[PDB]
Amino acid sequence: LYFQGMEERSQLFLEQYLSSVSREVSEKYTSFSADYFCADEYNANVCADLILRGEKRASCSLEYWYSQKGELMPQVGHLQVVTNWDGKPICIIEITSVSKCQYNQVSEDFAASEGEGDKSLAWWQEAHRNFFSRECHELGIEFREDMLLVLEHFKVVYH
Numbered sequence: 188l189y190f191q192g193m194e195e196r197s198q199l200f201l202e203q204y205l206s207s208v209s210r211e212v213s214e215k216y217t218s219f220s221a222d223y224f225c226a227d228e229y230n231a232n233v234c235a236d237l238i239l240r241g242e243k244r245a246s247c248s249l250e251y252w253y254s255q256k257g258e259l260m261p262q263v264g265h266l267q268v269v270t271n272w273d274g275k276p277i278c279i280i281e282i283t284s285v286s287k288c289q290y291n292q293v294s295e296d297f298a299a300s301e302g303e304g305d306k307s308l309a310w311w312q313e314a315h316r317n318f319f320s321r322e323c324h325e326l327g328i329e330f331r332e333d334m335l336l337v338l339e340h341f342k343v344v345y346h
């Protein structure tokens with residue numbers, strides 16, 4: 188009932204996970220999606236694998252999407268089928284926490300949880316400033332370092 192329109196490969200994979208847990212556990216889930224991470228093939232595929240392996244355990248996005256563009260906030264307990272660029276399911280993640288912080292207040296520990304490149308805050312900054320500047324242009328605003336982010340932490344539950 189909750190994900191009839193999901194792309195078939197990812198729907199099948201998600202059904203495998205739900206069937207591999209007890210009815211009590213599967214029936215609690217109410218929020219589902221299927222997507223890749225990032226905006227390019229190289230990083231989508233690297234990130235799916237980092238997530239698979241437990242190296243990438245967090246992500247973030249501009250809060251502007253939710254407060255101004257009306258996107259639904261991420262929820263604890265959400266399941267995402269993590270695909271590669273080409274839509275092949277790689278793993279399933281469950282959101283474990285959601286919070287907010289300014290871009291310029293992102294910590295070294297959060298950058299390390301995101302797990303990309305050398306895990307440093309400098310690498311995290313270079314990557315995110317670029318990506319968020321592009322999104323901001325399409326949104327019709329300029330990126331500022333004081334903008335709020337939505338931080339998500341998550342865990343692998345299936346692969």
Ligand SMILES: [Cl-]
Binds near residue numbers: 287288289292
């Ligand atoms: Cl903050």
